[PDB]
Every structure is written in structure tokens, then in C-alpha cells.
Design a protein around this nucleic acid. Structure first.
Ligand SMILES: [Mg+2]
Ligand SMILES: [Mg+2]
Ligand SMILES: [Mg+2]
Ligand SMILES: [Mg+2]
Ligand SMILES: [Mg+2]
Ligand SMILES: [Mg+2]
Ligand SMILES: [Mg+2]
Ligand SMILES: [Mg+2]
Ligand SMILES: [Mg+2]
Ligand SMILES: [Mg+2]
Ligand SMILES: [Mg+2]
Ligand SMILES: [Mg+2]
Ligand SMILES: [Mg+2]
Ligand SMILES: [Mg+2]
Ligand SMILES: [Mg+2]
Ligand SMILES: [Mg+2]
Ligand SMILES: [Mg+2]
Ligand SMILES: [Mg+2]
Ligand SMILES: [Mg+2]
Ligand SMILES: [Mg+2]
Ligand SMILES: [Mg+2]
Ligand SMILES: [Mg+2]
Ligand SMILES: [Mg+2]
Ligand SMILES: [Mg+2]
Ligand SMILES: [Mg+2]
Ligand SMILES: [Mg+2]
Ligand SMILES: [Mg+2]
Ligand SMILES: [Mg+2]
Ligand SMILES: [Mg+2]
Ligand SMILES: [Mg+2]
Ligand SMILES: [Mg+2]
Ligand SMILES: [Mg+2]
Ligand SMILES: [Mg+2]
Ligand SMILES: [Mg+2]
Ligand SMILES: [Mg+2]
Ligand SMILES: [Mg+2]
Ligand SMILES: [Mg+2]
Ligand SMILES: [Mg+2]
Ligand SMILES: [Mg+2]
Ligand SMILES: [Mg+2]
Ligand SMILES: [Mg+2]
Ligand SMILES: [Mg+2]
Ligand SMILES: [Mg+2]
Ligand SMILES: [Mg+2]
Ligand SMILES: [Mg+2]
Ligand SMILES: [Mg+2]
Ligand SMILES: [Mg+2]
Ligand SMILES: [Mg+2]
Ligand SMILES: [Mg+2]
Ligand SMILES: [Mg+2]
Ligand SMILES: [Mg+2]
Ligand SMILES: [Mg+2]
Ligand SMILES: [Mg+2]
Ligand SMILES: [Mg+2]
Ligand SMILES: [Mg+2]
Ligand SMILES: [Mg+2]
Ligand SMILES: [Mg+2]
Ligand SMILES: [Mg+2]
Ligand SMILES: [Mg+2]
Ligand SMILES: [Mg+2]
Ligand SMILES: [Mg+2]
Ligand SMILES: [Zn+2]
Lengths: 157, 208, 68, 105
RNA sequence: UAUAGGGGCGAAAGACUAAUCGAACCAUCUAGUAGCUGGUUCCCUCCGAAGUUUCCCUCAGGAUAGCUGGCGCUCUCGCCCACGCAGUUUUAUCCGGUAAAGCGAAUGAUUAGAGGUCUUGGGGCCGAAACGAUCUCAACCUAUUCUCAAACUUUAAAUGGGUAAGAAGCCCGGCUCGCUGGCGUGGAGCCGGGGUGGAAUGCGAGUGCCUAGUGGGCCACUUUUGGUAAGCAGAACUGGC
RNA sequence: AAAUGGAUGGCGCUGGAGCGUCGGGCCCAUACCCGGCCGUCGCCGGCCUACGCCGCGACGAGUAGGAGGGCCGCUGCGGU
RNA sequence: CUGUUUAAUUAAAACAAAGCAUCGCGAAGGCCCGCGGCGGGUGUUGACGCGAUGUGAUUUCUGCCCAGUGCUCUGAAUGUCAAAGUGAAGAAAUUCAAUGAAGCGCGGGUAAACGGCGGGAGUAACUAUGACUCUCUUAAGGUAGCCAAAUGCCUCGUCAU
RNA sequence: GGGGAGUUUGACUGGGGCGGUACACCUGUCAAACGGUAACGCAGGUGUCCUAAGGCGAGCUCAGGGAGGACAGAAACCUCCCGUGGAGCAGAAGGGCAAAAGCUCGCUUGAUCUUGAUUUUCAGUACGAAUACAGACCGUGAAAGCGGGGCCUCACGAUCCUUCUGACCUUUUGGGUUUUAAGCAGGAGGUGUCAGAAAAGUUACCACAGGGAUAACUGGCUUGUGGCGGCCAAGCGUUCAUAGCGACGUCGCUUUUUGAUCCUUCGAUGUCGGCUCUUCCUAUCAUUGUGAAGCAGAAUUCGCCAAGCGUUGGAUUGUUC
RNA sequence: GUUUCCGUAGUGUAGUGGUUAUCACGUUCGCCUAACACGCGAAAGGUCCCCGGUUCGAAACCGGGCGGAAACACCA
RNA sequence: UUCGUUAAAGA
RNA sequence: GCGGACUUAGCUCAGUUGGGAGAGCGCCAGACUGAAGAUCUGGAGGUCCUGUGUUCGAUCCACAGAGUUCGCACCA
RNA sequence: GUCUACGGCCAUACCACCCUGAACGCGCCCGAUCUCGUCUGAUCUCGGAAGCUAAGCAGGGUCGGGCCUGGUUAGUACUUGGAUGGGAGACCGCCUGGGAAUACCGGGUGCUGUAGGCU
């Protein structure tokens, strides 16, 4: 009763935002898409040959197959029953990388460097990411001036 | 003409006269200024305005009857060209009617549920100004009495406020007399142009 | 005789009665669905690995075990 | 629509692009002594009335125009079929148009 | 005495035909069929729902999926540290275009005043007429100003969705390729070796078969469509009957 | 201003048994804690009906439905 | 009119009726029964008869349309039209071609057969009313009569009693 | 050939029918910033069109505005400048597009044959549509590359049967040849109720199994409509707003009308009016006691306490009226 | 109320298969006649219901109103 | 073959 | 789907064993009459439904198609 | 301190107007016989090199328009979760958390890779 065709809710989602119409930039193409690359999906309005679907916009998947001028991505899509790994063929203009895995590899490199320093100098490192700790017993300063007294203001329309 | 008891506080999305409505008749109000329309800014110093309190819908016929009552009290108190009243509110929301009996059950149930356009009302937020009257300094109480006569005619509860600003502009009456003479404000009809300092120098050379 | 048409009420609760599952277990991912020219690369590479890997990798393992 | 007389299309006998005479496909006269025709005559003979159903409520007004493509080359004679989408009026092979034509209504 | 059942007979009401006639009676097929009413017989224990997706001459029904039960199987804790999981949070990483706000920003509406002068059109005025010249209205432009938009928008929340937080991961060395190709170039596969202390909290997990019932729902805070409104009709999250 | 006579539940209540802000005590549900007993489940002990005997701990509602136990019961058959 | 009928909710304006009409039939026949026979009813009958219909005494009339649907007459001069029969090709099954019996069509009649019968505009010494005229129109355009009727929504139509 | 026989009379539906298709597929909103998400919700569509409006390459920039130029004017043709999409892309909209996906020109049918994979609806079934590949034969371009229909979102169809196409294919039954027939693979003939039965009406002579899942009475929610009050006062009232009235606006009450819904009632609550009879309310027609008038008297009008008691006989219509 | 159809000179109309102002009656002028009717030849007379969108171009294609003409409004 | 009308009076 | 019939001037029609378009009613202008009608004379008006093929030449021959009509048969 | 060829980020780098440009380079320019395509050597191609920075171009400037960023707007409008909070409703207030935009004001206006040449 909504007449579920292809892209029936995409008035804003597959649109180039503002002051960014025209030809596609070439650094979108000039990227290294190997296997296992955790990449995002963000649809385009210029190239109509490789729109994934309206359901896969903003999702994040893993590359399994690479071809001449597209790529193949496995994406966990949620349906009524349970989430499913689905094999999609999306062109290159719709795909950018995800920097979360890059930050994790930076943390792995720093942990390997700290473990090398630990094995070298016998120094304990605490390489586990502890979360935001409670504030320690720090010591404030109020020199020079008295604390400014604040009062609530009267009501004026 | 249905009563205003059945068309009240907002329960629908705004449905304006547009490409998709195409069927609303003409509104009751057509004009919006009644006083001295060509009044300059330095002529009438103060203004009193009428602030709503309830998130309601005011009808165009209510705006008509209220502006007629306020105009009549103004021309009986301070005469013609001694005031300038502006209805700030403009009606755009189109209410709908689902009429029947056109004493029988055998014409229409709830089959065609969507209704035809009846008239135009105006969605009013809390604090939105209904009317504003600018006058002289000596006509302080007459604006109060005119908006008080309009208060009994608008539905719901609403208050009156004598503004700190100099008339219809957004600048203060305390700063107006000291600041239009030195640098910034230049009168342009009933409105006031505020110039910044980020202009070309030809504007400053045309001044002074 | 008009009935209720469609709803999604009392559906997510039935979904979470049984613990919505990731597939969560794919070691050595499934190989079908990949470019047949790449398959003509990989299968011929695998069968010539089965054929001609013996002596060079054996002597290399002996060399790295002698040097290690 | 308009299709031409000749067309160079892949024929499956020699495996190269060869020109093809393009003709309109007549449906063809139905032959007696076919399997379902003899079965329907055997089922119809007797006091049974109309045994198999007969179609009544036609709704489509157009038919898919299919083209008989024949290989023009001698001693090949590759004949096959190419379907087009649904069209109401169908010009056979002539009267191409231009852009500098006056309206002259 | 004659007319006997889809027959008789009817001055015609479809009336009469053995208390039955818009098709008599008796027996048989026959325990006709029914998605439709009513009913369905001892106790205790354990687990325990749905009125929803899709399809059907489908709408009082059924099939399928979902929810549920039963039967197990494969493993794991039980003697500085295993794997895995989550209606949860954090750390990053992307996604949106709703509330809001705006229209002196595009689209669409809409109010009033001012300044400017190319323009044609209404008036009288300098006067044989004259873009020779004067005033005003008309319209246009400029800079303002009033009020909005579910099918407008530059901006853009809160809430929310996907992904990663390791031994299936890093690093090194080498073989294969009929893929690719300046190049032992690239890319995949295969082999060998080295280091598991890699966010918070909680939890022992994975998997196979068979199947009942369900397929008429309702109410409430909140977000909402039609209606004046309804203990009205229809949607979303959560909870309850 | 509405139709039988009637509803802060009624009775009554004004230095309150009304209204708004509150303080200290007090009353109870199958809710919570401790304890006795039954049952289910989980983990377990023993070379004492092994289908029995103990040990510890956590939980028990429920229509449609699905299982398990019955030294519940009726009728008849072979053993006893 | 006398008569008859819904026995057990109707007694009638209902049915029947004489009168008026129409059609089929000269018996190897008209209308019917029967599973069957040259078997039966009308028929021990013969157009002043039998069978089938509409209207319903007497008086006065039976308006106009065969466009439609039926019925009927007429012709191988003539389209279409099935078996069987004919001719050709072939090894044969089979295919093709001509000829064509009824029916339909083509032509006529039939309304006491089913049935049907108009809306506009302008026009006479005050006004209305409008004999009259013009246009589109069908097959024919409601004629003689009758009426707010047992038939008229507006309607408790208007006037008189 | 209704003389007789058998069978059918789609579904949704604020009861049924008529009306409509919300029955198949699209666009934007509802849709609450992932996605999905309803109604006979809203605004608009579709059963086509195209041998080019497909594919490639090259060249050029559109709509509009200003200024000029013989006839020439508001619009005939040319030139210069401004010109970010204000035009065009076949059609309903949304998105997108400027040495372009737009206009013109030149060649060409890739709108060709074939096996798998994936996305969409979804049960992760099918059809339809689409995407990335792969293998042949090609088009264009100098080459890069692009192209296996339309810039994308829709524009379409199962089993059985028929017809056509293909192998120098298989079986035609004891063995050969030949005609024929059957099969294999893919196009068509079509199921618009669009996952697809072949289907007219009436029953007031009706029957059966059921439903208050579902109308026609009351009662229940609401008060649009009806009726009855109030608020501010522009005016009527010779003067004078409020003795009596009161528009333009606006707030309410009641169920004596009507409407909306379907909550109970379908193994039945006997469904209009009249007669007789009892009781209750006040929004008072009269009577008792009062206030105010444009209350001289009389007669009226507007209010308060007030339902104790009265509130007719008839012609008409079945009447309520 | 719902579904179809129509609106054009003073009057009844034709005309879209997009790009006109068509016929007939009526008015005015002049002729034939002694003069009228009749007859003739011209002329005027159109907001193609009003307001908008499609395009090079609309009355025509479409939409919102305006005013009409047919059909239905049944069971309780 | 067809061709309509012209009052009241006026000798 | 089969067989067969008709498309001509503004209207109704004619026209083969093919050398090609006419009759009547229409329109216009003359004459006749005191005027009209009839009559006489002189003009204007055919895309013969469309495309192709044979012939030197096709309205007439054939094929295909486009509107109208007549019967006939109906497995999805 | 620059430019040329190819570029990446796509206005901090676009538009209007005014000044500056030494040397390579870019260009305007100088003519159609061959390659070339036009109504026109105007556009595109062919061998130049007499002048010129007038223009493009490259810098700078405008209390410049725009663009980006930062204050203000504002802990406001909104908003997850809660209450036997208020009010007849309309809506509003409180606890816990998150938190936007226009006006108004202030600052900037290109950064770079590869290959090559001038001072
Ligand atoms: Mg349901
Ligand atoms: Mg058989
Ligand atoms: Mg037979
Ligand atoms: Mg029988
Ligand atoms: Mg009896
Ligand atoms: Mg019966
Ligand atoms: Mg029987
Ligand atoms: Mg039984
Ligand atoms: Mg339990
Ligand atoms: Mg279906
Ligand atoms: Mg159902
Ligand atoms: Mg039931
Ligand atoms: Mg099931
Ligand atoms: Mg289980
Ligand atoms: Mg949205
Ligand atoms: Mg908003
Ligand atoms: Mg069961
Ligand atoms: Mg059920
Ligand atoms: Mg509801
Ligand atoms: Mg409960
Ligand atoms: Mg009390
Ligand atoms: Mg208290
Ligand atoms: Mg239990
Ligand atoms: Mg009786
Ligand atoms: Mg006889
Ligand atoms: Mg008689
Ligand atoms: Mg007669
Ligand atoms: Mg024969
Ligand atoms: Mg004859
Ligand atoms: Mg005849
Ligand atoms: Mg008259
Ligand atoms: Mg008459
Ligand atoms: Mg029958
Ligand atoms: Mg139904
Ligand atoms: Mg959404
Ligand atoms: Mg959401
Ligand atoms: Mg230019
Ligand atoms: Mg568009
Ligand atoms: Mg756009
Ligand atoms: Mg190009
Ligand atoms: Mg290929
Ligand atoms: Mg029947
Ligand atoms: Mg009766
Ligand atoms: Mg009867
Ligand atoms: Mg009312
Ligand atoms: Mg109900
Ligand atoms: Mg009811
Ligand atoms: Mg309900
Ligand atoms: Mg009962
Ligand atoms: Mg009773
Ligand atoms: Mg009873
Ligand atoms: Mg009393
Ligand atoms: Mg005379
Ligand atoms: Mg040359
Ligand atoms: Mg040349
Ligand atoms: Mg030159
Ligand atoms: Mg320069
Ligand atoms: Mg210079
Ligand atoms: Mg600059
Ligand atoms: Mg600036
Ligand atoms: Mg809240
Ligand atoms: Zn070939």
C-alpha cells in the first residue's frame, strides 16, 4: 500500500548536498580497495549505474570481490527475522573507507611499540585502554580575587 | 459558518493555500494597516502590542471584527491620522469541513472522510504578537483601551505590553533619540535602515 | 465487517524472545560469487602449488632451520 | 514502431555477425493431428459439452511483435526470432524521418 | 370410474393433490457435505504463546514465516592466565534531513512604506503641435519591512542505525599463477617461523529434528492521520489486559 | 437549567474531618529479609530397592497448547 | 350483470363470462401425449369445426409509426454455410480446389404482434396569452377523448360548493 | 430449441447496494533525521512512445534579459554583452546533468548469442525490473574506454495446449528407409480479480447453517446540526449603546430534532400513531408574592423566588407535525 | 449528494483529427414596387462562461470555481 | 406553371 | 481467424473481354417574362481510399493495408 | 620570489572595478602552399616571430559583494527518561541528561605533489 518500488523514499538521501554538484572528483576513484577492507556505503546521485539500494545507505561492510570498475561488499542487513550477511555489487563512486579500523591499527602499533619497550627495559606499561577515570583529589586556586557572587535575575518580558 | 468552538487549538499539520490545496475561498481580511499608513518614524514615538498566551488558532473573521473595533475606537478617540495600527498576524492555515445532510441516513456515512476547505485561520504561538499600534506619547491609555476592546473579542487569554522599542523597529526607544542623530540609523519611510560599518566608502562619502 | 489492517506492535518483543543472531561464524569465507578470471588465476595457482612446490620449499625450510 | 529491412546480428550457425532479412512473424495455421488437438477432439467427442475451458475476459490490446531474422548469406539459412516490447502500431520497414521537415499542417 | 409427482388437476389463489404442496408420501444412496453453532469425560508437576509478514474468488478459512513445546547431540568451568555471547555503556568511525530555525537565501505564498527614473497608459497645466519642458497616478528596479509552508530550504539538534575494540590478529622469509604486466610490477593462493597481559559490566555456549495452538484483538504515557468530537476509525516505540 | 429520590462511598465535617506547604509516629499485600515444610531444576557424594539412599544452592502464577509421573480408577487376558 | 376462488389471516377492483377480434389447419393436416410402433387425445370430428391467444355486456370510436425485436412470403439471379459425394498432388495417411441443402443476410408484408408517440426561440393597438413563423430533430412525434382520478414528486396545485 | 436439464452471479467496503479501485505497478508526503510502518488519507500518474528519443565520437550551449540593425510592430532574421541551470532530457513527479546525461552532425545496430552470481518485493519462493562479472561475434573512437536498450525510480504474465526457430540431436516399441507424431532448449499466443475458474438476473412464495465480526428501535460516547443562554458593544430606539433590542466576533449548556460510531441485543427486548392512567423537570402560559420600563390609568413587555394547582371542545390527515 | 454532458454575435448551432470566428434567424443601409410583405447585395454584431497551468501557438489539452441538462438516491 | 395586401372617406 | 461485399465532384450515382472520367441535383453569369419557376447557353468543381508490382500506360489487373458491413468457427 | 605542463583539495582560491609585471615561459599577433574544416584562416589545423604587455594570465588594493572560521543569539528554541506536579482544557513548571540556527560583531581570503626554466 506504499507501493514498495526501488528508491521510494530517497528525495534527500541520494542527493548531492549543496555547492557540490557537477563532475565527480577523481580521488573517489583513485583508492585502494583490497580484500577485507571495512568500507562505508554512501550513495550518489550523479552515477546511476551502481546505486546499492535505499536500505544500505550509511551502512558498513567488508569487501569480498573486486572487479574492473566496481566492488563487492558483504553487509549485515536487519530484516524481520534476523540479521543476514548479504553480497552486494556496488560501484566505486558510492564507497569510502572507514577510519575506525585505521585507529585500531594505530593502537595496535602503539601497543607493539610499548610491549617492545617493556621487554627491553623491564617497565610495566598498562597497555589496556581504561575508560575515563574519576577525578583525582586536585587542588584549586582562588588567589587574587574573591569568588564572584551570582544571583538570579528578575523577570522582564 | 460553523462556530469557533469546533475550530480551536492546533491538531493538524499546516495546510496552506498552495499548488495542492486549490480550493480555499478568499479570506475575510484583505488589508492589514488602517491608521496613518505613510507615517514617518519620528512622528509617533511609542507602540503598544498584544501578546498571546495560548497556542491557539485565530480566525480571519475574528481578526476582521477585532481590527474594525480597534479602528473604530481609535477614530473616536484620537481621530483619523493620529495612530498607526498593524495586524502582525497573517492567516494561512486552511481548515476543512466534512458536511452532511445534503434528515436522512441514506446519503453519506464516513465513506469520503477527507473534507473540503471551509476558511482560513492563523496558528498563533505563545508570545507571538497579534496587533501593534504606534501613537504619540499622550495616547498611552487609548492604545490600552483599544487593545482591551479587542481582548474581549479574541478567544482565549492574552495580555498587553507597551514595548521598549521605538515603534515597529527592533531598536530601543532609549537608544533611538541618541543614536539616530550621530551615526547609524537613517529613516526610510515608516521603516528604518540600519547601516553597518562594513560597507564601501562611497556610502560614507554620500553621508555627512 | 472491517478488520484491523496492519501493525508492527508486539513484533520486536517476539524478535528478542529468541536472541537476534549474527551469523557470527565464517572462518575461511565462502568462495563462490567471485570473478571467474580471478578463479582461473587461483585454481591454476593452487594445482601448480600441488605440483611443483616440493624441493624448493623443502630446501628453504632446511636452510632456515639450519640458520635458526 | 519502425524496424529496418536488414540487420546485422549474430546467427548461431556460423557464429559471426551476418546480415539478416527481418520479416513479420505470422502466428501460423494450427495443424490437426497434434497431441493436444487429438486429445481435445477425443475429449470433445461425446455428450460432455465444452470440456476444457474457453477464455473470455481479454484485457490486453497489444501483442509483442516478434521478428523473423533470416541469414542473407547462401547455404546458411539461419532463421530465429527476436521479440520487441508491446507496441500498438507497427511500421514494417520504411519511411524514416528527418529533423528539417516542415510541419505543413 | 379416469387423470399419480417435475406428474395430475385447477372459472387461476402457484390454490388442491389424505392435518404436508413455489414440487406429496415411504424406503435406499446416507452416518450426503459443511470454512458454520453447541459439546468433548481422572489428578499432580514443568514449560508456555498469538492475533503479525507474504500468498490464495482470499476477508468467519487455509498455506508459509514468526511466537511455543518435546527429544537430543557437540563442547566448556569445575586446581599470570580459555573461547564465545549481549534489547547495555565507553572510545573512535561513518549515516540521516525530523523537532527547531530561516526566507534583507533558491521555490512557493504574502503586508506596508520609502528612494530612483528607461517605459507605455489615464488627467489637467506652459501652447498652433513638438521624447522643447513641468506635476501626479500606472508599472519596473533598488535597499528595507510583516507573516508563513506535510508534498520549501542554506543550517541543523535530541533520540537512533551500521562498523572495530586481536592469537581467525601483526611481522618476517620463501614457492605457484594459464590473472595482470616496463620491471622478482601488482594481486591472490600455498609453506615455514616469532612473540596472547590488548575497553567497562554481566553471562556457560553452539547446533539438529518433530510439532501443537495462533492467523477477530483491546487499553495506556508519548509521537501522530481523517473527523467538530467520540468509550470513533487508522499508524510508531514501550508496557499491560 | 432536566427530568423516580441520591450521592467527596455514606455519616458528618468550619480553632477543620476543606485548601496549599511540610515534620515526627502509626496501619498492611501473596512485595522484601530470616526461618519450617513440599516440589522442580542445577551441581554432587557413596560398591546402599543403584529405577534406592543422602548433601548444597536457586527458583515455583498462568488460558490455547506441549511433555513427564501417577502405589489414581474401570473392564477383561497370561503369569503370580 | 348471475357465477367462481387463496379449505386454516383476504371473497375483491381478482378469475370466469356472452360479445368483439386475430392466427394455424382441407386429414400423408393444425395443436398435443408417449421410451417404443404410421401407437394415441381432439375424432362417433371436417372451417357455422377443432386448437391457441388479446380484450371483456350495450352505445360511440379503434388515431399515427415495420426504425428495433418477433412472425410470415419469395426467388440455387445471389454472399456465407456441415457431413457425404467429385477432381488433382503423393508410396499412402494427408493436404488442396470446385460445386453447395436448411438457416442468417439480401427484398416485401404484418402493430385488435411485443411495443413507441419531443425539446427550443420570437411573434396581435395595457400586460399576459400567445392562432402564426424559423431552426435541429425521429420511424412516428400523443389524435379523438380524460384527469391532480385507484394514475400529479412539487401539492394540503388554483377557483367554486 | 429456457419446452426441459445442470451450473454461476468476483473481492474490498465505517452494514449491504449504487458510487469508486485504495485489487497489479510508480512519484512526493503522511513516516516521528537507518530501514520498515495503516486507512475508500492527501496531490498526481501507467497498460504506452521511440530505427532513434539505442550505442559511440566530435562540435556547440540553453530558458530569460539588455543594446543595436530597411520594410519590422509585442512576438519574423542577424550581431554584441549578461546569462549556475531559472531551459531541455517522450510522457506524473522526485533525484541528477553545462567543453554534460542537453542541441546539431557522422557511422552503426550491443535492443546480438550463452552459463552462473547478486539486489529489489520477499517466506529471503516465483514473475517483473536491475547490478557487477565471464565467454564469443561486433559498433564507435586516434586511443583510453564506453555499449549486451531508453540517465535512474514502473510501464508488465505461471501449469497444460498451440505456433515458430536449432542440431546434418533422441524415441517412433521385432529390424531397416521415408512421411508423420513425441521430446530437448527459447520467443510468441494470456490469465487487468494482474502468483492466473470458463459464468446474467429476480425472489414481497422463499429455505437452511450462522453473525449483534454486520445495519433497521431504544439505551451509551460526541454535539456537527437543532434548541436555549452569556460575554465586548458598531448601531435601532425623535434625543440617548445596554427600558426593550443588538450586527461583526466569541464562550457555553441540553439531548425535546437530526447526524456520526457500533459498545450490548440475531437459539427475537413485539417495530408508528391514538385512547386510558401515574409520576417527574423548568428553559413560567396563567395564578401567589416582587423588581424595571419609552410603567398617567387600562393593556403589555423584560427579570427573581416559584412546578403547589391548571394548562379545553372540535372540522381536516393513519398521522408525529 | 453522486455519476455523465453542455456553455460560442441579440437568438439556436457547426467547428479541433491544437494554430478558423461557420451556418441560419434577427438589426441597419440601398435596390425592385405607387407603397408594403416577399426577394436581393453588403455591413456591423464574439470575453468561444470566469480565473490559471501545458507549448512556438489554447476556447480546443488539463485544473479550480460559476450556471445549467439527464440518471440514481432502495431494504429495513 | 405561379404571382399576396392596400382602411375610413372623399363628386 | 476464414470467405465475400462498398469506398468517385458539395450530394446521389454510372464507367474494363484496360488508351481513362460523365449524368442529375448543387454554385456563378447571361437570355427569355411585367416579375418568379421550368427552359436555353456558357463557365467552375474529382485527392477515382492509401502503398507497391506487371504493362508503354492501371479508377478498372494483382498483392498488402485503412474505415463500413455480412455470415461462419472458437482447448490456454 | 616565481612561471610552464599534468594535477589533488573544489570559491580562504568566484564576481565587479583600479594599479604593478624586470628575465624564461604563457599569450595577443604575423599568412594560407601543403594536413584541415568553415558563409567567413572568426573557430580548429600548417611553417613563422615584426611588435606588445593594451587583454588573458600572475601579484596587490577596495571601511567591496560572496566563501570559510570564531563570538553573540543561548544554556534559549527543541529533546531521551520520570512523577498521585499545576491547569477544565490550552499547554506550562520541576529532576536527570544532550543541545541548534538567522539577525548583530570580529578575522582571513589559497595550500600543495610530480617534471621542467628563469632572478
Ligand atoms: Mg486481522
Ligand atoms: Mg478417456
Ligand atoms: Mg456429437
Ligand atoms: Mg427432479
Ligand atoms: Mg393439504
Ligand atoms: Mg419452493
Ligand atoms: Mg424432487
Ligand atoms: Mg458424523
Ligand atoms: Mg513460567
Ligand atoms: Mg491475487
Ligand atoms: Mg484475512
Ligand atoms: Mg465463530
Ligand atoms: Mg506453521
Ligand atoms: Mg525449545
Ligand atoms: Mg523525510
Ligand atoms: Mg517546523
Ligand atoms: Mg494439536
Ligand atoms: Mg478466527
Ligand atoms: Mg483505535
Ligand atoms: Mg497485568
Ligand atoms: Mg456530601
Ligand atoms: Mg491538607
Ligand atoms: Mg505452573
Ligand atoms: Mg375471508
Ligand atoms: Mg390433426
Ligand atoms: Mg365491449
Ligand atoms: Mg391502435
Ligand atoms: Mg469430405
Ligand atoms: Mg427487388
Ligand atoms: Mg424487412
Ligand atoms: Mg407581444
Ligand atoms: Mg393530448
Ligand atoms: Mg434453467
Ligand atoms: Mg462484501
Ligand atoms: Mg523513514
Ligand atoms: Mg525513525
Ligand atoms: Mg559570454
Ligand atoms: Mg523532474
Ligand atoms: Mg531538479
Ligand atoms: Mg561529448
Ligand atoms: Mg563482453
Ligand atoms: Mg437463480
Ligand atoms: Mg402485498
Ligand atoms: Mg403471486
Ligand atoms: Mg449550534
Ligand atoms: Mg458492535
Ligand atoms: Mg447501533
Ligand atoms: Mg472497532
Ligand atoms: Mg435474548
Ligand atoms: Mg417484554
Ligand atoms: Mg419475548
Ligand atoms: Mg406537580
Ligand atoms: Mg378599400
Ligand atoms: Mg588551402
Ligand atoms: Mg579543404
Ligand atoms: Mg588568422
Ligand atoms: Mg597580460
Ligand atoms: Mg596592464
Ligand atoms: Mg585577489
Ligand atoms: Mg567582503
Ligand atoms: Mg516529558
Ligand atoms: Zn550465418
Amino acid at each position: 500500500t506504499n507501493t514498495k518500488g526501488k528508491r521510494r523514499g530517497t528525495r534527500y538521501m541520494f542527493s548531492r548536498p549543496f555547492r557540490k554538484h557537477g563532475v565527480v572528483p577523481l580521488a573517489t576513484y583513485m583508492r585502494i580497495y583490497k580484500k577485507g577492507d571495512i568500507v562505508d556505503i554512501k550513495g550518489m546521485g550523479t552515477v546511476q549505474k551502481g546505486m546499492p539500494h535505499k536500505c544500505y545507505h550509511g551502512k558498513t561492510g567488508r569487501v569480498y570481490n573486486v572487479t574492473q570498475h566496481a566492488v563487492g561488499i558483504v553487509v549485515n542487513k536487519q530484516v524481520k527475522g534476523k540479521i543476514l550477511a548479504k553480497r552486494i555489487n556496488v560501484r566505486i563512486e558510492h564507497i569510502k573507507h572507514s577510519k575506525s579500523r585505521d585507529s585500531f591499527l594505530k593502537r595496535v602499533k602503539e601497543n607493539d611499540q610499548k610491549k617492545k619497550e617493556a621487554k627491553e627495559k623491564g617497565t610495566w606499561v598498562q597497555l589496556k585502554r581504561q575508560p575515563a577515570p574519576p577525578r583525582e583529589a586536585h587542588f584549586v586556586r582562588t588567589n587574587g580575587k574573591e569568588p564572584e557572587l551570582l544571583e538570579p535575575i528578575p523577570y522582564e518580558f | 459558518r460553523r462556530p469557533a468552538r469546533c475550530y480551536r487549538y492546533c491538531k493538524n499539520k499546516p495546510y496552506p493555500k498552495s499548488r495542492f490545496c486549490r480550493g480555499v475561498p478568499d479570506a475575510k481580511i484583505r488589508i492589514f494597516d488602517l491608521g496613518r499608513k505613510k507615517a514617518k518614524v519620528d512622528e509617533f514615538p511609542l507602540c503598544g502590542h498584544m501578546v498571546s498566551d495560548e497556542y491557539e488558532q485565530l480566525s480571519s473573521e475574528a481578526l476582521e471584527a477585532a481590527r474594525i473595533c480597534a479602528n473604530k475606537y481609535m477614530v473616536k478617540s484620537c481621530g483619523k491620522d493620529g495612530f498607526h495600527i498593524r495586524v502582525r498576524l497573517h492567516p494561512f492555515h486552511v481548515i476543512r469541513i466534512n458536511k452532511m445532510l445534503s434528515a436522512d441516513r441514506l446519503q453519506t456515512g464516513m465513506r469520503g472522510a477527507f473534507g473540503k476547505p471551509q476558511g482560513t485561520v492563523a496558528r498563533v504561538h505563545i508570545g507571538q504578537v497579534i496587533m501593534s499600534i504606534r501613537t504619540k506619547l499622550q495616547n498611552k491609555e487609548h492604545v490600552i483601551e483599544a487593545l482591551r476592546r479587542a481582548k474581549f473579542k479574541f478567544p482565549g487569554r492574552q495580555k498587553i505590553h507597551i514595548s521598549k522599542k521605538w515603534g515597529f523597529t527592533k531598536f530601543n526607544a532609549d537608544e533611538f533619540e541618541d543614536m539616530v542623530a550621530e551615526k547609524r540609523l537613517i529613516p526610510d519611510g515608516c521603516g528604518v535602515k540600519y547601516i553597518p560599518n562594513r560597507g564601501p566608502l562611497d556610502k560614507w562619502r554620500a553621508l555627512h | 465487517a472491517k478488520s484491523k489492517n496492519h501493525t508492527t506492535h508486539n513484533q520486536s518483543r517476539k524478535w528478542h524472545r529468541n536472541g537476534i543472531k549474527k551469523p557470527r561464524s565464517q572462518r575461511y569465507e565462502s568462495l563462490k560469487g567471485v570473478d571467474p578470471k580471478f578463479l582461473r588465476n587461483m585454481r591454476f595457482a593452487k594445482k601448480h602449488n600441488k605440483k611443483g612446490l616440493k624441493k624448493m620449499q623443502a630446501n628453504n625450510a632446511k636452510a632456515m632451520s639450519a640458520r635458526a | 514502431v519502425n524496424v529496418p529491412k536488414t540487420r546485422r546480428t549474430f546467427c548461431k550457425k556460423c557464429g559471426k555477425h551476418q546480415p539478416h532479412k527481418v520479416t513479420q512473424y505470422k502466428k501460423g495455421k494450427d495443424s490437426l493431428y497434434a497431441q493436444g488437438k487429438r486429445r481435445y477432439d477425443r475429449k470433445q467427442s461425446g455428450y460432455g459439452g465444452q470440456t476444457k475451458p474457453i477464455f473470455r475476459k481479454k484485457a490486453k490490446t497489444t501483442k509483442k511483435i516478434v521478428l523473423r531474422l533470416e541469414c542473407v548469406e547462401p547455404n546458411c539459412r539461419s532463421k530465429r526470432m527476436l521479440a520487441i516490447k508491446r507496441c500498438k502500431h507497427f511500421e514494417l520497414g520504411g519511411d524514416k524521418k528527418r529533423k528539417g521537415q516542415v510541419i505543413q499542417f
